Symmetry: C5
């Protein structure tokens, strides 16, 4: 109890930081337009970023490691100040050291920290390209289905097939985001009986592909045209593959634990080597170093699995908006090209 | 009012800098030719870049953050000089510190600043390749349409289809540049009734694709030849996808706010750590450091969304010039190859 | 014997480290899901990584080089302390040097160490993409076989062909992992007589491809449809090629021996240059430098051949689970699309 | 005149440097073979590069910026020496400063300089791959035309078509090199009347493509075989696109002017901060720093537009040599494969 | 003679180093297997690399530049020691300087050295991927020929065609390795009369392609199947293109001479700036700096043209072994799939 009521009060702050950053992963993102870019490039961005630093969830996640190292700096400083005043027995030395060992290893720590964050940014870029390809393939496939499928006996199957190409990016988004309601997001895109078959499947994006693939086998098409249409499905399998490996396989964990351990050991003895030159400036110096260096690691950690930093709902809605515009433009494009003739 | 007439005079300079850089985003760019490369590689480039530094809009955007840090250096220096002359009560210490904490963290700041600018340059390169592919696909598709389409009953549809392949890059350029007049830019490329249907569409580059796709369904072609032609449309969907994700999804904003915050905190205490070694040289030193380090961040910020730094009007005009040269060379190439035979 | 009983006691620790890390290469990995990402991003990761540092097998592999350099620091320190007390003849100088030569070469060592680890991480990423492509191709090929193959006379050949597409990733996994039992892993995927032919082949993933390729020649298909199906086999040859070159061709060994030699020479004279500023702090300083710098090299060494850090059994089971779900959804998707009609 | 006869004598050296480097862009390059690699890897390369440093045109281009900064170092040193001897009124201070501000910003300058040169090398690599693809596509297309085209009535058209595939890389080389004589380079590759049509076209590589595309429409081919042959033309459009964007779009000029300005300001005050430690060694120190740091920038500037550093004439001659060897081997390969049968 | 008998004794060591490294380029390499990876990752690699440092040919190539700089350090040290003892007239100053100029430029030298070696490693990776693609294409093409070619009248042509797909990687290996005996390496792969036609061709890998391309025109195939088979030849043209550009076009030589010149000037004045702090420790310090920094450049130089560091004979033998296993498995796979039916 005496070691169990103190081990629980120490968890109050890290638990709050953990609850705060997870709520920030569930925030809804929006695509940038032109006026958001003007605000992004403004000369006031430096002041407004500094003023928004106590509402940023990166900095709130950094509160446990920054306070822990700052108390260690205060403890080392208090002990050193007490020794300098001869308040201790005399066997107790001053916890000081040369900064030369840290000068030699300072560029290695920086290069390793930036390497891990560059590896994390590469995973964000790969996630962004994969979604770009899936949305451009869904737009392309839908555009070709509106042109290719001519026969009036295939009106219902063409309608059904265009509903599954719009539903596929929504299914993939629900497959990669933790609390997702695919039933709610597909309620007005799929038929009531089509959505029951998808909801009974463990791999829902896989199930929509199978409806698309079976629909292309039932259309009255020449075989050359069908091979052209069913070659557009492979981008959906590629999308599923790339997105599932980014959630399944993180950056090799030996590299991420090395960056953690190196940053913890460096900030544990940093007050000891800074003492001769700084004295009690070790406290604010350790505070600023821990806040600056653990924030480079925190940025990389938060974008390592990148699907919650992407506006997947706005990208999915673009395909739906593009397909309904094209079904309304069809009579007026057909008329104009018949007039040409 | 007393705190509201001073909060407004402080906005005069950042508002001017913001109006100056946005006007520089709307400047018209031209493709480099050989004599511009000779001028670019000249030994006078070092002098002429230095002389053009007060007309460069990067440096004008840097005027608010550089003056703000320079006044902070002047305030810290004035306070320190007043303390050294014993003009203050005596409880007021000298704002000085060891430079050793900044020596240890100097390589981390540099690596992070160059990482953000490299990420911005990667987005410029991706925007450049995407336009290269769309212009080469428009040239290829047009070249094949001039060869493939033979039948004299399809003369008007071939004319119409070649107008939409030239119009597509203009539509995509108007779709990614903020103040664009697609009606003015397509006035002499599309028919009056064809341009009305495009102007009524929310996704105009999408609408031109649908005219191309419907035109290929109405041509008297063998099915194998039609599949070959409609496979050339996918580069247009890819172009739309890549260009829309560069405007919709910026570099993850946690990484860009970290570079901003780190640069602001570093220049706020930089006069304090430089005092013992520099005294009033903290003012020009802080001026040069803020101007040098915030300019690396400013370059990255301005090319992060890269379409205004690209000569999209000259690249679009190349496709138009290439297609009209090919329609004039057609009778003389046909004659020469008939002579061979 | 006197030089042969001491040369054997020195091998006790490196042999134990070598047996410990190899047992860690044979540990079974699991795909990350959402709750493992929450635990990965927690604010307690910094404390729990530090507490798990004496059970991490990277650090146990670092035990021989870190102790060897720490004893060298103790030997140099003991000799220097004995000279300072005039316990030696007097011809014996103090083993001290300026740190200026190491200050000039410190950034070169860091850049080279991070380059070798970045090259190793690039090989891990290439291994990860190759598996992503092979699993997405196996999913795509299986999905098309379930749609394409219609004829009821080809029921047994379609069953057989879907067993070989699920078996191929298991065969490739057994081909790249050292102690593998392909007979045990293919016992319930292949027929008893089909598995005997695969087990008699030296290149088992190659043998499964040949069964797939022969099965596509015996199906009653139109030739255009067969060419479409046999074009899906090339991703399996590409998978075999990429995976075999990662095991056959390491990072050029001249670059890896340079990083080893540079790190050994740097830690051999590091106590000599640190003495004037540190005295007996050369022992913990050399301990921390050797542990920090050889751990960056160790991470790169352990992920250089990356297939044991990948959850190849879970990725292989995903294809098997996806194909059996699709064979159970087939009657209910066929019914729904017939109802449409 | 007094300010106009001195402004002209100062241009003598930069004009000479500009005339010298442009003449080096027009030098003819040759492909490396095995004995040039042995000479390239020799242990004498370090001495022979140092001895050839006053004939290297990079160093001659660096002569204006290196002399300008060296005279500034001499002026600052002369003024400081005159002040130390009390030869001035006494209101004149010594132009000295702490080197600490430059120590903090030294790693930022290095990282930015190497980033710009890496961006320039990436443009050289992209230019090299684009030429590799165009030459391999010209070899592939020619090889297929020699096999595919069988009919004896198409002998003259097959001859003509193989002349245009060899002529296309020569036309593209003349299109990207400033003083080119396409008439002289195509005089023995094209017919006299075919070369007149190409010379009358503004986009000559585009004109050759149109002859190839029209020749494939006039051959007596099955449609499936023609689609296979005309799919080999797209690599030529891709080649034109990639090569034209490298000449049209340089590295964003905001990034290149920042590297210029940073290097000029750094070498202007470098004698002032080096004085206390170096005195008149500021002159050779500034000379070596300006020569070393402006040479990293000069290398990047000279390879930024890379087509003059590539042996485009030797790569073009390889396609011509490969096609004539294949037309002489045709009777003896046909005989051997008929003997098999 | 007096200046000609001394200019020849100085060439003894660089000539020996040049003869030693070229003999190391001709050593035969073997593919890594699992037990070589265990030995590669062992904790004894740090000791065994250090012990093998006087048999490594990188270090033997470094012997001329390391001895030359070490004698310069000995000459500068001897002159400085003689001046300190007043053994000279007195007009002779001490060759000493501040290390501050080298501290500012130390990170630029390191970044440039690692950039050149990263560029060299990128050329090794490109060479490795190109061979991976050619071997996977040869495996794929052979696998399809064994399935596709059915007719019993084409037995000899199928045999011949499978001999040319195995012979092509051997021909490409002989085309990129300096002393190669293509006649000896193709003696048991090609027919005696087929090998005479290949030996009479200047571009032997090109000649084998032409036999493959002519063999596919003589087979009794449907045209759709022939187009599928002749599309597998393009990877051979791509392989030839990528491999020839790596031997023809080195890293731009302006960048490689800059790294050479910078490293030579840096080690020439390094004893002068290290003297005040080191005295005769300038000799071992210059020895270690020259050995460490010129070894990073030497690694890059030796892998810049990478084909001799690749096990091209083992990769070529894998295709031959895979094709003969598949011709022996053909009767037993045909039997098993006929039993299914």
């Amino acid at each position: 109890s005496p070691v169990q009521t103190l081990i629980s009060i120490l968890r109050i702050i890290p638990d709050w930081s953990d609850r705060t950053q997870e709520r920030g992963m569930r925030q809804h993102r929006t695509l940038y337009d032109h006026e958001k870019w003007m605000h992004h490039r403004s000369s006031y961005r430096h002041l407004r970023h500094l003023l928004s630093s106590l509402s940023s969830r990166v900095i709130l996640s950094l509160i446990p490691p920054v306070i822990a190292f700052t108390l260690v700096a205060v403890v080392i400083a208090s002990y050193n100040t007490a020794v300098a005043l001869d308040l201790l027995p005399g066997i107790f030395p001053l916890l000081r050291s040369s900064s030369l060992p840290y000068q030699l290893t300072a560029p290695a720590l920086a290069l390793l920290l930036v390497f891990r964050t560059e590896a994390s940014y590469s995973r964000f870029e790969e996630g962004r390209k994969s979604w770009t390809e899936v949305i451009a393939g869904a737009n392309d496939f839908a555009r070709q289905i509106i042109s290719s499928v001519e026969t009036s006996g295939d009106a219902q199957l063409k309608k059904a097939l265009l509903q599954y190409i719009v539903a596929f990016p929504v299914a993939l988004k629900c497959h990669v985001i933790y609390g997702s309601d695919i039933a709610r997001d597909l309620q007005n895109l799929l038929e009531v009986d089509d959505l029951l078959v998808v909801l009974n499947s463990k791999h829902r994006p896989g199930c929509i592909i199978q409806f698309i693939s079976r629909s292309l086998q039932l259309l009255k098409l020449e075989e050359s045209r069908r091979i052209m249409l069913q070659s557009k499905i492979s981008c959906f399998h590629e999308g599923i593959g790339i997105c599932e490996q980014l959630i399944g396989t993180p950056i090799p964990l030996s590299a991420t634990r090395l960056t953690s351990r190196f940053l913890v050991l460096w900030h544990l003895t940093l007050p000891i080597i800074l003492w001769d030159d700084c004295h009690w400036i070790v406290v604010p110096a350790t505070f600023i170093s821990a806040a600056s260096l653990f924030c480079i690691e925190q940025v990389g950690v938060l974008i390592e699995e990148p699907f919650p930093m992407l506006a997947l709902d706005d990208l999915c809605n673009s395909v739906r908006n593009n397909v309904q515009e094209a079904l309304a433009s069809e009579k007026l494009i057909r008329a104009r090209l018949a007039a040409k003739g």
